[PDB]
Structures are given as structure tokens and as C-alpha cells.
Amino acid sequence: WVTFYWHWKHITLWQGNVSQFNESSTYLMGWLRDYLWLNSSQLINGYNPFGMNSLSVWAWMFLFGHLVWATGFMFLISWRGYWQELIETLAWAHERTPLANLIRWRDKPVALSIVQARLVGLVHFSVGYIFTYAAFLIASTSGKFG
Amino acid sequence: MRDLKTYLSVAPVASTLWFAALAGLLIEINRFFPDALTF
Amino acid sequence: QAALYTHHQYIAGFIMTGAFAHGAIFFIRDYNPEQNADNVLARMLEHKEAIISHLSWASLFLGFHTLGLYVHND
Amino acid sequence: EVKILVDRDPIKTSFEQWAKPGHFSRTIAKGPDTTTWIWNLHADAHDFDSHTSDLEEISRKVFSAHFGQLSIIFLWLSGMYFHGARFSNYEAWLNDPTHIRPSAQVVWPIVGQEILNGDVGGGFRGIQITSGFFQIWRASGITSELQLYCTAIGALVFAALMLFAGWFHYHKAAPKLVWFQDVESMLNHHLAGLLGLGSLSWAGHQIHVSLPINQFLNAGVDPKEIPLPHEFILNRDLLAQLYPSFAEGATPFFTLNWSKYADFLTFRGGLDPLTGGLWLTDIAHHHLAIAILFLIAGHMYRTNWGIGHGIKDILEAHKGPFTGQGHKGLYEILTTSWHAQLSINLAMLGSLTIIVAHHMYAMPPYPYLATDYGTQLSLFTHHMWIGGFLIVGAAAHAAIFMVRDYDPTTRYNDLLDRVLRHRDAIISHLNWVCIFLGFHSFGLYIHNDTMSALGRPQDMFSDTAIQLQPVFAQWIQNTHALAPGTTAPGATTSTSLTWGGGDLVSVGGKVALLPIPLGTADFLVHHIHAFTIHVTVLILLKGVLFARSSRLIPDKANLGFRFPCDGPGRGGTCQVSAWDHVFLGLFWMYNAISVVIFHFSWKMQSDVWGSINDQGVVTHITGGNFAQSSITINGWLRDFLWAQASQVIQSYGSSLSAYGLFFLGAHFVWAFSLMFLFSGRGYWQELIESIVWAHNKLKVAPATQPRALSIVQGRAVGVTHYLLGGIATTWAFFLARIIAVG
Amino acid sequence: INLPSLFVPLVGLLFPAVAMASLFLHVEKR
Amino acid sequence: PPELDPNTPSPIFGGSTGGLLRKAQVEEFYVITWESPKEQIFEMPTGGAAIMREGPNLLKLARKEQCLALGTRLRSKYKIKYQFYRVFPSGEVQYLHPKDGVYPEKVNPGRQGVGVNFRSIGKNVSPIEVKFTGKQPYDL
Amino acid sequence: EAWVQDPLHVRPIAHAIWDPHFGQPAVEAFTRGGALGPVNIAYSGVYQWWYTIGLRTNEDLYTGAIFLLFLSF
Amino acid sequence: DIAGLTPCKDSKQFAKREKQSIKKLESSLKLYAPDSAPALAINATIEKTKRRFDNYGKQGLLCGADGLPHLIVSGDQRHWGEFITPGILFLYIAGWIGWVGRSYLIAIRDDKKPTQKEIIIDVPLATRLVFRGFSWPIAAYRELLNGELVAK
Ligand code: CLA
Ligand code: CLA
Ligand code: CLA
């Protein structure tokens, strides 16, 4: 919230029309449409079926950030017991598959710990959070210089 | 009948009747005195 | 200017959460109730329900009304 | 000896139990000590197993509850017909269906909400409906609000009759157990009776009302001047002038000169080009033949006479070298477990609804339906969701059957036992194929996004680069297009204009259907579908196969169907219950159906829907952009979501603004669901303690002690708001877009 | 280019392989 | 005096993918025994149905918890008594349950307390008082 | 050195990029500033910082780096 | 004026907004016959729009550059209708609800099974307490002064 606010107040300042912020910011559709949607058009065209440009990295990192964030949701929503039972069927399958039978693990495969998954999920969530917004922030501001 | 009056007093039933009455009151105040921003 | 402001407000946020996380760790590993008996730190634990429930109240007030006001405008 | 067996006055009708919350449950009936009581009351309301262990008394409850549901549906249909009669532009819509937008709801003027009454044509102001009722009523030959009023009264009567029957068959004449178990009689009566006499009697309406009235509508005569439907029954010559087969009456039917009826019973195929829907003469001939098949099929099973099979005989006779005893014992299982029945029926009813989605878009069965892009996008999406929910329900009651009803000592079955004896081989195989699918479907997109970002569009999986042509689907398409002249000689044209070939059908300058091309992009999105469906089955099937036990939890079945876990030990056992697998499978069902409907929306707007020129220059809604855009995730972000979200986010200030608000509202509910899914009740119970203290300080604590939601409820609340917000967002996104550009 | 063509494959292919192989043997040792 | 362990017959079972794995060859495994009055179907803790034989019954299992789960089911449903053991890869056997010939639910003399703290739980010291000692508050 | 002579008309360069996955259109698009190859532009503000406090020449920067390397050691 | 605003009754952008709004509705109005039900309805919205804009102008509301009313909640006596006054009304009603709510929990707290009157409202009892709310400031202040309001 604070950085959205800082950025949208400044990008409309730099562009020479603070009134875009003064009017569209009093309701939330304004933020979604006139801040996020309006300012995404150069970023998501950093590459398209017609070529690419220097905004290509940020377009790719922008989606990368969405992907890491969403992967975090897996560790946050599905919890351990589901995955421990699944891994067991893979332990079985591995010890019953010829040729692969020859190879053996030195560390028994186990689902992550309860706490571990909260952390791994949090880290994915935070990492994608930051990479998504930084890609947007930099591309939207540098694609026009405010 | 007394069993029915007990049921009509159960939390959900008493809530819809209460909030229905409330909604009707607020709707009619807004039909009679619409667009009130001050007071 | 956009990257610099955003970079420090996120750094600051993480740093603030660590400040409370190590307050918690202090309370478990290091806090000696008897050598702090009746002092300002012990008295915080004595009235934790007062502290927590007023933060709860302040958060409820700000959420209902801020969201209520934006939703009205929408 | 199949006979009517009923008990007289089993349960006394009394308000006594209405006054006693939780009477059905012995634990709940004692009253609340805590707020957790409030929720278990509702979670257990329809769990008739936990109320009583008597199978007869359970069956009586589900029987009358079914009447309750039928009552609700009739009341629902009563309102649909009533609004068409009283608050609609259906009469005006009949004169100009290409332009007038169906509307059957009008909002009262309060707090500025009149703006939702939109300028929909016909001198009417209301909300544009997408249920498609107008196309139904027209195809039924309904011509006035008077006819809808009478249908609404009949629906209301049937609603009362169904409610009366539910009270009657529970409190007055409740069927005995063996009456419900007569599955042979039921199957016969549903095939021949419900399916057969339903399709036959509906065929009669199509012949004597729907065919003639639609011929006048399509000829152009005003609906107020079309002869009333009963005049085609009172006076045959009216019919005979449209179809001279009626001149000879019922004589050519019994003389096997059925070819004489070839003017109102046809096998044309394709679409009526002046209406955009399937030929009403092909449809009437469909219900005719279909009615015959069910009337004879309802004679397969043995009852009070000699002919027919016992269903047990057919089961006990199928068994192989790999399976042993085979289907023996299944007749006892499916006549004693309601959940086993419900699992199969949910599986098939769900699957069938997904088929209805496909068939109704590629073979539009209603006049002027195919060109109401808003109704058709709604119908396909609506039935996908309904289908996907019912399927996930099959896994739950399959899982519920394994915990509660499975008993190898009394009701053994070697097929079920054989699967339980190698569930590790099944689940590990489904695990690997899911990993293969995911890499070789979604990973190709990631390849494309990375290639396209690096300035290397020659290395993408594209129609203009490394091509992945769906040869087999392309082959099936080209086959069906050549069926009418070859493998289906009686068929004039193909069953669908989608069949890669033919031409095009337009109604009112709007494209109805053309051949749908299937290229590289269609290859990718089809392997996403196979991937997402596989993972959904992996989670759900794993949940049923280890519902009783696993190497981790040897006595899991004793923990019940629905339980949070068995504690932090064994490294952690959260979400081992079969119920938790259904919780996880809903998210994946949601995922799978979301990209299915996205696949549908983008394809139709890009390669099918659009406006045709005076000379035939078709302009599609998004102009064929699907081929080069839908092969990267950035293409779906930019060219689909970002571009098509325009309508909903600029809907404020117009009659579509309610979609604007729902778009934001559903985002909110979806984000709100994450609070429940990401946290845990220990945090919340401690929080509540500080809050309870504050209430105690002022003498305002409730005697019903506030508790955090149970672990399972947290999950249920989470997934419920996740699905509601998620789906509602797409709902508001779809309707705003398609009503604004369709 | 005369140095990036040397250090980029060294720090991005060789060093991680040598590091991943080193750590694999320390963590697996007994 | 703990029971013995011969080579009694095992129940009638077609085999499943739920049984012993490499751990049994290299670490340990478990065997439960019991006497049934008649042949009857029961559920294997590893999935599926098997038929126990009347009289002696031996069953190899991968985990202790699988043994106790089956045995708990033998007392409740079948009312039969059971024992089980831990078997090592050297052939060494170890009797496990019921330990002193008596199921642990019922008091039995000769058992010595393990892990009993003679105070209420809320009297554990604060972590700071056992810091840099190797003990937790619940160890004193 | 070009930035300090025209600080409002030169995108400051962070470092060179050398990525063998690039196609030719990516090599062109990222060639910016006065550089002879693909580069990243710096959003850290170090050019303005170093310029304001006195740094002017690439040498100034080199001996600063060496001194900090000594401090690291 | 306050905060660089100007009275909505003098504001040109306020007047423009009313004009653009009526023109919007008139574009729809011209679709329908003048006796028709939609024409009457759109006209009803138009008159209500006109009543609203004149009403905000006559109540003294300040407008910003956007042409929209902006509320002054600082305490300034020309704007008590924008916060102080509806706020006193809110607190009066909110306290009434809470005081009545506490009266009921106290009334049933010594009953046999108290949670029974929490899931099944004793409506007769409630009709007797509902008007205790009218005087909650005096009743709550009185329970305070004599140790009855808070527990120790
Ligand atoms: C948009 C998503 C969302 C929302 C709305 C909330 C809302 C809230 N969170 Mg939460 N949270 C979220 C995401 C969200 N969270 C996530 C992702 C996490 C990480 C796990 C958390 C973790 C978390 C913790 C750990 C805490 C909160 C707290 C709070 C409360 C903050 C105080 C407040 O605003 O009071 C106002 C309340 C609201 C704004 C909630 C919505 C009110 C609705 C709109 C009113 C409905 C009225 C209407 C008639 C309803 C009709 C519905 C119909 C079906 C009957 C509030 C209930 C804190 C709390 O409980 O403080 C007291 C707290 O301790 N949250
Ligand atoms: C699925 C069924 C369905 C749905 C969703 C609707 C929805 C709607 N109808 Mg409709 N209608 C239906 C069926 C339905 N109708 C049927 C079957 C008929 C024929 C009998 C009608 C006849 C009809 C008329 C004549 C009108 C509507 C109107 C409306 C609209 C406003 C209704 C309103 O605010 O009521 C007001 C709200 C209430 C009356 C609710 C009162 C709240 C109480 C306290 C709830 C009682 C709860 C209690 C415990 C249970 C009682 C059960 C009892 C019936 C046995 C709304 C869009 C109006 C409209 O469109 O205006 C432009 C209108 O005038 N409808
Ligand atoms: C006035 C008529 C009447 C009366 C006095 C009774 C009395 C009784 N019935 Mg009976 N019954 C009736 C009509 C009646 N029934 C009808 C019409 C049917 C057909 C559905 C049944 C079917 C039936 C079954 C199947 C069972 C009973 C049971 C009972 C006993 C307790 C039921 C209870 O707690 O109800 C209070 C319940 C309610 C008020 C629930 C409301 C019911 C409707 C259908 C809900 C529909 C709401 C709808 C979904 C909208 C909500 C969604 C939206 C708001 C979000 C009691 C002896 C039960 C029993 O004896 O078991 C011990 C039992 O199992 N009855």
C-alpha cells in the first residue's frame, strides 16, 4: 500500500497531471484500472508476437514474479501429511523399478517439515511479491521516464 | 404453537426478521430523504 | 527515485518484523521473571490482554471504516 | 416379490423438534457449551449416517429430502417463467431477436441503482439475462406472457405437490427398506418411464406445437397472429399445409410407410440457416428415436414375472484371469450403501454436464442462440463448473464409502480388494504421468516465453516455427466433414459446422458457426487440460485409496473421513484425511476448469465469433490473435486478461457497472480466503482470549464461549471463499466483456 | 568480451558444479 | 519370561504393494503373532483383506505401529490375544509387547517409572535458568 | 565519464551483460548508453551519489574499489 | 476557503458535472416514447439528480478542483453536518445497541442453562430491555460511579 501510493502519486506528478490521482484514487477501481492496468501496457509488450525490446527482461521477470508467488501458495495451502504419503509411494516405486533399483539414496526422502513449509511458502511468496512489483515499478517508470 | 414460537425465536430466524425490518426502514428513509451526504 | 524509495521501505518492513521476532525470542530464551519482578517490562506481560485487545480494536475500527469508505465511493 | 411396502405414521408431525436445535444428533441436542456447537449443527445437518445407523430410516430421509429439492427447483422455474411473463421484453424480443437483448429482471429505483436497468431494446429497461430462457420459450412455440403466466402457475403447483409428497412419504407413508432396494424395478421405471415417456411426450409437443409455430415465426408472420397451439390439434389441415404427412394421419405410422413423414421427421444435420439453431425437424426426430430406445431398455431387468435379468447375475458373471472373482458382491454394496450410489451418480452426472457444455456450443439446439454470444459463453461456462463440482463430489463419497461402508468380512469384492492391494503402483504411476504432462505442456509455454523474450521467435513451439500440429484431432475433423456423403449417407450435412469443412452460418450479420481450426496453440492448451485433469485425479484418487490406511497411518480409517490430522509426529501428518484430499482437489478442479473456460472464451472470440460482411469478410472479435498469442503466458497476460478486462474495469457509470463491483468484490473474497488457508486456529484462539478478557472486564462475555473455527472448518471456509471469489471474478469478467462486444 | 567469455562460464557453470560436487561429498560423509 | 518365536504359518494373503521394503533387510522389521479360534477374513494394516488361520499366526510388518494397530483390532473385534517382536538383520529377536506379559493399560508391579516429574507442569523453570546447561525445563 | 559531462542525457550503466542465450534482437535492444555492447542501466543512484561527492574519472572509481577491497581483506 | 476549496454552489466543475450527468440520462431518455414507463423512470432519475445537486449547494458543502464535495471534519462549525452531527447520532445508536446487548447477557447470565437464551432469543425479555438503550449514557455512567460497570 505505501509503495503503490508513492509511485502512483509520483508518476502522475511526473506526467504533469496530479488530477489523475486526485480523482481516480478515492475508489478502488481507480487503483486497479488507472494505476495497475494503465501502467502495465509497455511492460507486458517488452516481448510480443511482433518482437521484443529492452523491456523484455522486466516482462519476463514480471511473470517470473507471478510464478514464484503462486508456487508459494502450494507450500502454504497444502500441508505435510498429504505429501508424506505421496512420497512413500515413490519410495516403493523406486525400490521396485529395475535398473533404477541399482541406485540407492543415502538420505531417506521425507516431506518437508510443517514449519519448513511455512518458511518455504513465505519465501516464495515474498520473493515473487518483490520481483513482480520491482519489474512493474522499473518498467513502468523507465518505459516513459515518468 | 408454543413450539413454533420457540423456533421463530431461534438465532437465524430472529436475525432475518430483525434485519429485514431494518433494511425496510433504511430503504424507506432513503426513498423519502435520498442522497443525504450531510447529516 | 522510485527504486530507492521502494527498496528502503521494503527493507524497513522486514527489519521491523525482525524487531518484534527477536522481542519474542527474548521473552522465551532470556527473560527472567524474578529479576524483572514488578518492573515496566514485567508489567507489560501482566496486562497483555489490555494491550492486545486495544490493538485489535484499533485495527477493527480502521479496517471497517477505510474499507467501508472506499467501497461506498466505488 | 416386488411390491409396494410402506409403514404407516412412522414419525409424528410436530413442531417439537423445530424448537430443539440439533435434535437429530445426540451430542448436539444437549445444547451449546461453546460457539463450536453452532457450526457442527450445520455441518452435520444432512449427514444422515451420523443421525441413525438404520439403513431403512436413512433411506426415508434421503427420499423426502429429494422431494424437498424438487420443490425448490419447481419454485425456481416458477420465478423464471413469472419474470418472463411480468418483467421481460420476451414479447418484443420475438419480433427482433438479432438486435433486442433478452432481459427478464428490473431493479427498483433506490440509491441510484436504476442505472442497472439498461437500454436493452423493445422499449424495455432491465438487466440482460444470459440463462437463455428466451431461446427456449421460442423453440417451445411460446408466443405471449399469458403462456408464461400459466407455466409459472403450473410450476408453482408442482412445487407444492413435491413438498406435500416429501412430508407424505416421511410422516404418513414411508417406504420400507426393501422397497428402496428393488433396483431392478427402479431402473426399468426410469429408463422406460422417466427417460422414455419423457422423450416421447416431449416429442409430441415438438410435433404439434413447436414445429408449426416456429414455421410461422420463421416465415415472418407476427406472433400475435400465429394460430394458437391448440388449433393445430383441433384442425389438422393447419398442420397438413405445413407438413402434408399429417393428411394421412396416424395411418402411415402403422403401415410402416415411415418415409412418408420425411417432411417433419428428418436427418438433415447442420443448422437451420435462417435461425442459427439445429433443425427443429431433426430435433423432433431425435426425441422420437431416443424415446423408443428408452422404452425398450426399460424392459431389461426382471421384476414380478420371468423375463429379464437379476442385476446380480450379470455382475457375478464377469471376471477374468487378472481379476479373479470379478464383480461378485457389488450388488450387495450398491443396495446397502447410499454413498457408493452417490459416488457413481456424481461421477456420471458431472461428466455428462461437461459433455452438455461441448455439444450445446458446437450444435446450438435453440433458434437465435448461436448468435447470442453472451448466452452461449455463459451456458458453456456454467455447465463446466457444475460438472467439475459434481465430479469432485464423487471422490468425497467414494472416500466416505471406504471409511464407513466398506466391510470385507460381510460385503467383500475382489475387484475393490485387488485395487487396494496395489494402490502404491496406481498412485505412483499417476504421479509420474502428472510430472511428464506438466513438463511437456506447461514447460513448452515457458520455453516459448523465454525464447520470445530473448529475441528468438524461430525457436518457439509455434505455427510459424517448431510446429506441434494436432494430427489426430485434425484427422477426426476432416473425417466427420466427409461423413454426410460417405459414412452417413442419410445425413445431408455434418452434425456440426465445427467439423473442419463445410462453410459458415450467420444470423443477422453475426457469425454463428464456422469450421474451427486446430493448430499448434490448440495442441498446447489441450495438453494443459490433460495435465490439470490428471493432477485432479491424482489427488482425489489417492485420497480414496488411502482413506483407510497408509504406511504412515495404519489405522487411518478409525480417525474417520473428516479429521484435521494425526498430529505433528511422524514428521507431521496434517491433511492425511480423505476429506483433506477433496479440499485439495477442489483447488485443482478450479485450476483446470478456469483454463478450460479461458481456452473457450479466447478461441471463440478469436477464430469463431464475429461479424460477417455484405460480401463475406468475417471480422472476428479479437481477429484471429489466438494462434500467435496463446502460446506464451505473456500472451494470456497481455492479449487475453489485460485486453479483455477493459470492459469490466470501465463498466462504471453504465448498466454493466454491477459487473465492475462484482469483479472487485470477488477479488476481495478471494484474497480474504487466503487468511484462512495460510493461518491456523491456535493463533486465532489465543487472540480471542485477549478479546474475551476485554468483554469480561465489562461484564459482556457470552456464555457461549467463543472458539476459533476448527482446523477442518478453517480449510472449508478457505476453499469456499477461494472458489467463490475466484469463479465470481471470471463471471464478472466474462459477462461484462461478452455483453459489451458480443 | 575477452574476459566475460571467460568468467561468465566459470562462475555460472564450473564453480557451481565444483561447489555442488564439493558440498555433496561433505554432506554425505560419515 | 517373554514368549518365543518359531516359524508358525502366516495368514492367507495374495500379496500387496504395501508390505516390507529394503528397510527390513538392512535396519529392522516386526512380526506379530496371535491365536485365532477359526479361519476368518480381517483387514491387513497395509491394505486389503487377508484370512487368518485358526491357531498360530505369524505376520511380518514393516513398523511397530502397524503391529499395534493390527493387534488393537484383534482384541476389539476378534477378542484374541497377540504379541509382537522386533527382528534385526542379524537374526536377533527382541520381545516388545505386551512387555511384562501384561498389557500396559493395567497397573502391574515391577514396572519402574520412566519420565515422571514429581511436580505440576506449570512449575517448570524458565528457559533462561537452564541456558548453557544441556537441559530443558522438563528434564529437571 | 560521459555521465558526469552530461548527467541529464545519459542513462547510467550498471555493468555489461554477456549472455550466450541472447538472440540478435536482444543484443541490439540492450545496447544502450554510450556502450559498445548489451548493458544494464543502473537504478541504484550510485552515479549521482559518486558524482555529487566528487568522483569524476574511471580512475577515481578504480582506486576507490581497490581501497574497499583492502578493507574487505 | 477551507483547504483551498470553494463552495459547490459557486463551483464551475460542480455545475459541469450536473450538466454532463443530465445529458447522459437524456441520451437514454430520447429512446423512449414520452408516456412510456422508461421515459417516466429516466425522468424521475433526472429530477432526483437535479434535487441532489441543488441540495448539496444549499447545504454549504465545499468542492475541490474535481467538482466534488469534500467533507470538513476538523470541528469547524460551518461543517458539523459532515461529521460531528451524524457522528453523535451514530454513537447514540451504537451505544444503545451495545447497552441493550449487555443488558440481555446480564439478564440471562444467572439462568439455569444460559447458552439457551443465546441461541433462542427470549423475545419477551428483549422487548423489556430494548428501551433501556434510550438512556445508556446515564445508565452506563451510573453503573460506573458505583462499581457495577467493570469487574475487578
Ligand atoms: C483481503 C484479504 C484479507 C482481509 C479482508 C482480512 C481481514 C482482516 N484480517 Mg487478515 N489476513 C490475510 C488477508 C486478509 N485479512 C492474509 C492473507 C493473512 C495471512 C495468513 C492474514 C492474517 C491475519 C492475522 C494474523 C490477523 C489478521 C487480522 C485481520 C482483521 C484486521 C482488522 C480489520 O480490518 O477489521 C475489519 C474487518 C474486516 C475488514 C473484515 C471484513 C469485514 C466485512 C467486509 C464486513 C461484512 C459485512 C457484510 C454484511 C457481510 C455479508 C456476508 C454475507 C455472506 C452474510 C480483519 C478481520 C487481524 C485481526 O483479527 O485483528 C483483529 C489479525 O490478527 N489477518
Ligand atoms: C428463484 C426464485 C426467485 C427469485 C430469485 C426472485 C427474485 C426477485 N423477484 Mg420474484 N417471483 C418468484 C421467484 C423468484 N423471484 C415467483 C415464483 C413469483 C411468483 C409467486 C415471483 C413474483 C414476483 C413479483 C410479483 C415481483 C418479484 C420481484 C422480484 C425481485 C425483488 C424481490 C424483493 O425484493 O422481494 C422483497 C423481499 C421480501 C418479500 C423478503 C421479505 C423478508 C422476509 C422476512 C423473509 C422471510 C423468511 C422466512 C423465514 C421464510 C418464509 C418462507 C415462506 C415463503 C413459506 C427479485 C429480483 C419484484 C420485482 O421484480 O420488482 C420489479 C416483484 O414485484 N417477483
Ligand atoms: C409444517 C410441516 C412439518 C412439520 C411440523 C414437520 C416436523 C418434523 N419433521 Mg418433517 N417434513 C415436512 C414437513 C414437516 N415436518 C416436509 C414438507 C418434508 C419434506 C422435505 C419433511 C421431511 C422430513 C425429513 C426428511 C425429516 C423430517 C424431520 C422432522 C422432525 C424435525 C425436523 C426439524 O427440525 O425441522 C426444522 C428444519 C428446518 C426448519 C429446515 C428448513 C427446511 C427447508 C426444506 C430448508 C430449505 C431452505 C432453502 C435451502 C433456502 C436456504 C438457502 C439460502 C437462504 C442461503 C419433526 C418431527 C426429521 C426427523 O424427524 O428426524 C429426526 C427428518 O429427518 N421431516
Ligand code: CLA
Ligand atoms: C447430489 C449431490 C450431493 C449430495 C446429496 C451430498 C450429500 C452429502 N455430502 Mg457431499 N459433495 C457434493 C455433492 C453432494 N453431497 C459435491 C459436489 C462435493 C464437492 C464440493 C461434495 C463434497 C463433500 C464433502 C467434502 C463433505 C460432503 C458431505 C456430505 C454429507 C453431509 C452434508 C451436510 O450436512 O452438509 C450441510 C451443508 C452445508 C453446511 C452447506 C455449507 C454451505 C456451502 C458449502 C456454501 C455454498 C455457497 C453458495 C453456493 C454460494 C452462496 C454464497 C452466499 C451465501 C453469499 C451428505 C451425505 C460431508 C460428510 O462428512 O459426509 C458424510 C463432507 O465432509 N460432501
Ligand code: CLA
Ligand atoms: C504456479 C504454482 C504452482 C506450481 C508450479 C505447482 C507445481 C506442481 N504441483 Mg502444485 N499446488 C499449487 C501451486 C503450484 N503447484 C497450489 C496453490 C496448491 C494448493 C491447492 C497446490 C497443490 C498441489 C497438490 C495437492 C498437488 C500438486 C502437484 C504439483 C506438481 C505437478 C506435476 C508437474 O507438473 O511437475 C512438473 C513441474 C512443473 C510443471 C513446474 C514448472 C517446472 C519448470 C517450468 C521447469 C524448470 C526447469 C529447470 C528446473 C530450471 C531451474 C534451474 C535452476 C535450479 C537454476 C508440480 C510440482 C501434484 C504432484 O505432486 O503431482 C506429481 C499434486 O498432487 N500441487
Ligand code: CLA
Ligand atoms: C452485547 C454485545 C456486545 C458488546 C457490548 C461488545 C462490546 C465490545 N466488543 Mg465485542 N463482539 C460481540 C458483541 C458485543 N461486543 C460479538 C457478537 C462479536 C462477534 C462478532 C464480538 C467481537 C468482538 C471483537 C473481535 C472485538 C470486540 C471488541 C469489543 C470492545 C470494543 C468495541 C468493539 O470493537 O465493538 C466491536 C463489535 C463487533 C466486532 C461486533 C459486535 C456487534 C454486534 C452486532 C452487537 C451484538 C448484537 C447482539 C446479538 C445483541 C442481542 C441483544 C438482544 C437479545 C436484546 C467492547 C468491549 C474489541 C475489543 O476487545 O476491544 C477492547 C475486539 O477486538 N468484540
Ligand SMILES: CC1=C(/C=C/C(C)=C/C=C/C(C)=C/C=C/C=C(C)/C=C/C=C(C)/C=C/C2=C(C)CCCC2(C)C)C(C)(C)CCC1
Ligand atoms: C513530530 C516532531 C517531533 C517529535 C517527534 C517524536 C517525539 C517522535 C517519537 C517517535 C517515537 C517515540 C517512535 C516510536 C517508535 C516505536 C517503535 C518502532 C517500537 C518498536 C518496539 C519493538 C519492536 C519492541 C520489541 C521488544 C519486545 C517485543 C520485547 C522486549 C524487547 C523489545 C523492546 C525488543 C520533534 C519534536 C522532533 C520536532 C519535529 C516534529
Ligand SMILES: CC1=C(/C=C/C(C)=C/C=C/C(C)=C/C=C/C=C(C)/C=C/C=C(C)/C=C/C2=C(C)CCCC2(C)C)C(C)(C)CCC1
Ligand atoms: C413446461 C413446464 C411444465 C409443463 C409441462 C407439461 C405441459 C407437460 C405435459 C405433458 C404431457 C401432456 C404428457 C403426455 C404424455 C403422454 C404419454 C406419455 C403417452 C403415452 C402413450 C403410449 C405409451 C402409447 C401406447 C400405445 C401403443 C404403444 C400402441 C398403440 C396403442 C397405444 C396408443 C395405447 C410444468 C408446469 C410441469 C412445470 C414448469 C415447466
Ligand SMILES: CC1=C(C/C=C(\C)CCC[C@H](C)CCC[C@H](C)CCCC(C)C)C(=O)c2ccccc2C1=O
Ligand atoms: C480469521 C480466521 C479465524 C477467526 C474467524 C472466526 C472466529 C469467524 C467468526 C465468524 C463470525 C463473524 C462470528 C460471529 C457470529 C455471530 C453470529 C455474530 C452475531 C452478530 C450479528 C451481527 C449477527 C479462525 O477461527 C481460524 C480457524 C482456523 C484456520 C484459520 C482461521 C481464520 O484465518
Ligand code: SF4
Ligand atoms: S499443524 Fe494443525 S494440522 Fe498440522 S499437525 Fe499440528 S495440529 Fe494437526
